[PDB]
Amino acid sequence: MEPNPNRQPVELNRTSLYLGLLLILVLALLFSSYFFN
Amino acid sequence: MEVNQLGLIATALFVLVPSVFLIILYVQTESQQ
Amino acid sequence: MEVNQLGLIATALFVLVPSVFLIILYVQTESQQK
Amino acid sequence: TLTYDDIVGTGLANKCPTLDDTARGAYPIDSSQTYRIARLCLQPTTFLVKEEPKNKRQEAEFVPTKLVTRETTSLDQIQGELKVNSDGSLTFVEEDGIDFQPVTVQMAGGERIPLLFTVKNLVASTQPNVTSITTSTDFKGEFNVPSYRTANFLDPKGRGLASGYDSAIALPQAKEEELARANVKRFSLTKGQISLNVAKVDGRTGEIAGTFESEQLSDDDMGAHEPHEVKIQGVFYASIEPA
Amino acid sequence: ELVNVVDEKLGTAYGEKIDLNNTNIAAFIQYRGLYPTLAKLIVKNAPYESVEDVLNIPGLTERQKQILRENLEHFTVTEVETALVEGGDRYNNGLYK
Amino acid sequence: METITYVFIFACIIALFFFAIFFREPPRIT
Amino acid sequence: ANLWERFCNWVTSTDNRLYVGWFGVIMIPTLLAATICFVIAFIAAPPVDIDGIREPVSGSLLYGNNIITGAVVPSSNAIGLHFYPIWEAASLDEWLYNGGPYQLIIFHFLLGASCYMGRQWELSYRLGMRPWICVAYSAPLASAFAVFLIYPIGQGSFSDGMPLGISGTFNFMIVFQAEHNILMHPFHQLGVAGVFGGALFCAMHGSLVTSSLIRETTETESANYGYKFGQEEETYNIVAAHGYFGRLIFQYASFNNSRSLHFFLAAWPVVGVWFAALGISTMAFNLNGFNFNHSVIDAKGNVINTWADIINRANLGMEVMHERNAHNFPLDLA
Amino acid sequence: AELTPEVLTVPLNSEGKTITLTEKQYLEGKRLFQYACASCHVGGITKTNPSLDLRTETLALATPPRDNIEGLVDYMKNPTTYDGEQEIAEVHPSLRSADIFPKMRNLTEKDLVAIAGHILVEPKILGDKWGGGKVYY
Amino acid sequence: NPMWRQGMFVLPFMARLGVTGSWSGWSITGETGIDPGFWSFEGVALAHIV
Amino acid sequence: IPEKLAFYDYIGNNPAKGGLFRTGPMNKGDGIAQAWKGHAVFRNKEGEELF
Amino acid sequence: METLKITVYIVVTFFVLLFVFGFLSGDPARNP
């Protein structure tokens, strides 16, 4: 099957990883009390 | 304390699903030439 | 049915942790220069 | 005239005999002769279960059900004495026959109701002054309803009344009091009532037929749960003979 | 409130003798001359207010009444228990060897 | 919750069958 | 061209990703019906009166089972061998109570699986292969016929067919041992030799070929990269493998001919499993395992027990407990 | 342990006369019991009526007494119910019913005696296992 | 104990447009022994899965 | 008075009485309603009706 | 139930005919 010319590589640099993990972990630290209720 | 039992699974997936999404993207970025 | 409450988190992590480990390795293999 | 091979598999074997639309005669009763029921047959056509409501101010109603145990429901080959009482009424005293059938019906939503459909030990009497049996003759009576399972029956964990374990052996150190109703099997015995409305009479042959309504309790699972009230409606056939 | 009536029955004379009102018919094999002819008559004509009432079963021959008298010491009567007499269990209680 | 877990895992397995057959790495001669 | 020709060409096309073929015209609808009914029943079916004694057994997940205890429950003993399609029932409620799904599933499965076997013949013919892969598959297929059809026929009831579930399978095995002493039957013993031997030779062949892979890779990469799909050269040195194996046992014990070796690999488990299937299919007519109960007697006549007598004591415990409310008379004659 | 003359000595009648069987007689009795009886009485039980067994104490309480050679021989000629009230040759194999139970057609007095001796000797060997059923297997 | 006491979210949307019965015989207006045909709550669910 | 009408006149069925993290059915809070107890009429010692 | 029976009978007959006519349509000649 002919290659699709619209494909693109995806990137996430290390800083974005650290920023994302911080966002996720802090959101969890914040919302977990309400999940346990 | 009588907490909601689903709180544990809710918190675990809340952390793990988006965290692994970022780890997948980061690692395949590092491995690109 | 009175099942063990930890059964759900045990099964969920049992599936997710090793599945994600494999997905990480596969995707970073595909992204290596061909 | 039909043979077994004409009948097998058709469902006709679960149907009581019928009488012609011409059978509107009268069967004379001679007060000095003795009589018997040589054959009584009861074919249920409707099973109704009384609903059990949360508030006891509203009157509960009988709801329709779906039969799930196929054409296995009829009572037949029942026989017994037919007494002539001094007031001219007749009393049927059931002695023997295929006088019970386990039946499971299903309510809307799926709840299954097993019952022992029966007229065991029926005693049923007519009105006074029955000099002849006609389409105006009725029978009213009571019967016994023994436990749906008998005493040897073992539950899925091997507990029973006349046999089996006396505790929940898979829970060796659990407290016994909370399990007593499930551990200690009990044998129910209750009363049901039935009315027989004669609609047809063959005066020459002694045969009669009509409709019946009976009320009785359902299976209580050897004391594990409360039974339900069931109403059974259907047709009946009986042949009366000098004895 | 919840009692196993069969275990309770074992604490009465039913647990020690042939109960003319309840015991399964094969128990009459324990003594000479009782099975199956008298054994059938006894079960058919139950229940009995007292053991000696078994002597009054209609149709018994003179020899049969004599044999019953020899075995009254091995008989008892207790209240009929529905769970032991329903299901035709006095003729076949589901026990073989 | 246990029924949902069992049916979920089963469903993931059937989906894996679909990808393993129709989106396999194609065999190539060399 | 006319449409019958184009459709027929599509059916028999060797270019379809999954081969259809004429056996496939039957296989595909019957396996789909069996599969769909099975999944729905395993999840949601209500309890089924397997033994015809109004004692319904719960098989489905929603009615309190897990993956290990769940099953599609065999049809009622009151049905016996009577054909019980949906349109024989007064309602789906009756059909479910009496075990209708079980009959629907096993009959569609057995038809679909027999066509699976013909399909294996069919495609091999279309590809110009030799024909006998389908003969190998006849061994598991024969086994499925034994436990779902032949054994019910011999015993007179689909309620004695193997249940479609994990614990239900164990129930079938334990009751089978009580009623046939299958462990003491030589055809089951051949079955065991077939699958123990099949597993042994599987490991053996795998280990010997792997031991003798020709070096085509470096220390870091997987050795599997040393084989390219479709290469003309064999990827291992069978002379080296058998020089090892002949010294492990003795020189002549080895299959030097790869064709004889691979024929043996096919024949040993297939033949053993043929006999396993024939064991079930002949115990179906109650020709049972060897009975040495009280075979050894001392000079006075005392019974001297053997291990066979101990087996008998275990069999008795199974026999007296199974279907504890179903028997009214002293002999279990089916 | 051995099959001794004492083991092979069994009551001949209700009066206490004994008879000492030979090892040959015992073997013949066992063979003939298998040939003509074991299909219903294997191991001393009764498949078509488990309430009645072949234990010596059961035979002693039958009417007339069957716990001896002559009693058992009479039974194989003219069987009765346990209370002696009814003759049951029409449904139980016997010399009287050998036209309908053909395996009885060729039994001599000696054969009946041998079968009886087997029934009496076997509980002396097997104890409660004889007539005990599967509980004792 | 109507649907809205029970945390039901899609059941009222099926009922709003005319799907009121179950294959198992009940209806949300409290009737018993109704034949909804294929378009019961279960039929709607199955159709969406397919 | 129909039980259904009385049941609408009860604040536990008012949708403005909940909480963002109080999850599940209303039955999880006040319970599964079984029956109307009837209308309560309060009175003081003078016999005046109080509301 | 009657309608279900007729429907299944029609469905089954269709596929069995496809099977029979298919193997009659020169199946020996459909080899390489």
Ligand code: CLA
């Ligand atoms: C390949 C397609 C196929 C086949 C072979 C079957 C086969 C079967 N179905 Mg299934 N079914 C199918 C597709 C199929 N189904 C599909 C697509 C659906 C969804 C609509 C269903 C839904 C369904 C239900 C709901 C039920 C069945 C049932 C059955 C069984 C009884 C059918 C019957 O009595 O017809 C009989 C047909 C005839 C008597 C006439 C057939 C005409 C031929 C020419 C007769 C001669 C053939 C001869 C016997 C052998 C020829 C072999 C050949 C090599 C020559 C049978 C196992 C029933 C069942 O499983 O009961 C346990 C049942 O309840 N099916």
Ligand code: CLA
């Ligand atoms: C170590 C002890 C031991 C061992 C090694 C065995 C070994 C065996 N036993 Mg025995 N057994 C044992 C102890 C043992 N047993 C004990 C203690 C008991 C008494 C409790 C038994 C009682 C017993 C019974 C009652 C039976 C066995 C049978 C067997 C055979 C089962 C394997 C088989 O049937 O393959 C054959 C292959 C199949 C059955 C598979 C069919 C596959 C079909 C055709 C396709 C399936 C497709 C599937 C649905 C979907 C695939 C998924 C994919 C497409 C996505 C095997 C020889 C069985 C047997 O002999 O069957 C004939 C049998 O019925 N055993």
Ligand code: CLA
């Ligand atoms: C094939 C047709 C079909 C049919 C007959 C149904 C039927 C149903 N659906 Mg399903 N559904 C379908 C396809 C279908 N669906 C598809 C393709 C999807 C994926 C998008 C869904 C996803 C779906 C969900 C998520 C839900 C349903 C639900 C339902 C039930 C309630 C319907 C409802 O309230 O919608 C209401 C529809 C509207 C209010 C339409 C809004 C239209 C806006 C205003 C259009 C504006 C655009 C327009 C161009 C403006 C100009 C208009 C012009 C004329 C002037 C009902 C049984 C509900 C249910 O009970 O689930 C169990 C439910 O929650 N469906």
Ligand code: CLA
């Ligand atoms: C339109 C969406 C919607 C609505 C209005 C409902 C409504 C309802 N649901 Mg349904 N449901 C839905 C979609 C919805 N559902 C979806 C998509 C699923 C699949 C997950 C479900 C699966 C489901 C189940 C399994 C159950 C319900 C139940 C219910 C009932 C109770 C709801 C409850 O307790 O919520 C509680 C709501 C919350 C706790 C609020 C969550 C707010 C989140 C956590 C905030 C996230 C913030 C975010 C991280 C911030 C990022 C910041 C960043 C940008 C920087 C109620 C009728 C229950 C019921 O009673 O069934 C009978 C029940 O058991 N629902």
Ligand SMILES: CCCCCCCCCCCCCCCC(=O)OC[C@H](CO[C@@H]1O[C@H](CS(=O)(=O)O)[C@@H](O)[C@H](O)[C@H]1O)OC(=O)CCCCCCCCCCCCCCC
């Ligand atoms: C659940 C599965 C069945 C669905 C049930 C409901 C039917 C839905 C409507 C039809 C949808 C079809 C989707 C199928 C896609 C596909 O497979 O394409 C794969 C190819 C592509 O089609 C090729 O397609 C080409 C044209 S094109 O690609 O479509 O453009 C064409 O030229 C070529 O000849 C053709 O072969 O098709 C084939 O290989 C031939 C048909 C194979 C059918 C196999 C069904 C097997 C079921 C067996 C039982 C399994 C039991 C369950 C196990 C978990």
Ligand SMILES: CCCCCCCCCCCCCCCC(=O)OC[C@H](COP(=O)(O)OC[C@@H](O)CO)OC(=O)CCCCCCCCCCCCCCC
């Ligand atoms: C039900 C199905 C659920 C599916 C799962 C979905 C998972 C998706 C989760 C997405 C997470 C995305 C995280 C991206 C994180 C990330 O990548 O950031 C870095 C990124 C930089 O972008 P650039 O354009 O420089 O691109 C670089 C690339 O390498 C990025 O791909 O910026 C953003 O993505 C914009 C969003 C701002 C994010 C703000 C960070 C917040 C700071 C810390 C806050 C916490 C501390 C507060 C203390 C009070």
Ligand code: HEC
């Ligand atoms: C089945 C068809 C049988 C065969 C073959 C034999 N017997 Fe039998 N036996 C059978 C029954 C049903 C009974 C009880 C009959 C009754 O109603 O009383 C018996 C009983 C006996 C007895 C008496 C047992 C006792 O008194 O405790 C004896 C001594 C006996 N049977 C011996 C016997 C012999 C020697 C047989 C072979 C020659 C034989 N029986 C065959 C059923 C069957």
Ligand SMILES: CCCCCCCCCCCCO[C@@H]1O[C@H](CO)[C@@H](O[C@H]2O[C@H](CO)[C@@H](O)[C@H](O)[C@H]2O)[C@H](O)[C@H]1O
């Ligand atoms: C339970 C949580 C699960 C979360 C799941 C998240 C899944 C995320 C999937 C990410 C897929 C990444 O997609 C991946 O992209 C890379 C580039 O970025 C592609 O890589 C392609 O580009 C790179 C860079 O130009 C080349 O070196 C490479 O040869 C080429 O194949 C891969 O072919 C593709 O597989």
Ligand SMILES: CCCCCCCS[C@@H]1O[C@H](CO)[C@@H](O)[C@H](O)[C@H]1O
């Ligand atoms: C497409 C999948 C549909 C599977 C569900 C079909 C059964 S329907 C199911 O039956 C139960 C018991 O009778 C009822 O309690 C329940 O309310 C009803 O939904």
Ligand SMILES: CCCCCCCS[C@@H]1O[C@H](CO)[C@@H](O)[C@H](O)[C@H]1O
């Ligand atoms: C996905 C399988 C589809 C099963 C089809 C079953 C049709 S069932 C059919 O449905 C009609 C409603 O359209 C009703 O009017 C009718 O009473 C009913 O018998």
Ligand SMILES: CCCCCCCS[C@@H]1O[C@H](CO)[C@@H](O)[C@H](O)[C@H]1O
């Ligand atoms: C994927 C196959 C699922 C098949 C389910 C079809 C159910 S069909 C459904 O059944 C009800 C129960 O009697 C009937 O009330 C109704 O008329 C009928 O249409």
Ligand SMILES: O=C1C=C(Cl)C(=O)C(Cl)=C1
């Ligand atoms: O003799 C042999 C046996 C086995 Cl199982 C092998 O795999 C090889 Cl290569 C030679």
Ligand SMILES: O=C1C=C(Cl)C(=O)C(Cl)=C1
């Ligand atoms: O003796 C044998 C035993 C088994 Cl299982 C076999 O398969 C063969 Cl082929 C010969």
Ligand code: OEX
């Ligand atoms: O079903 Mn199933 O298992 Ca063949 O044996 Mn008889 O039946 Mn019942 O018991 Mn044992």
Ligand SMILES: [Ca+2]
């Ligand atoms: Ca009238």
Ligand SMILES: [Cl-]
């Ligand atoms: Cl069992």
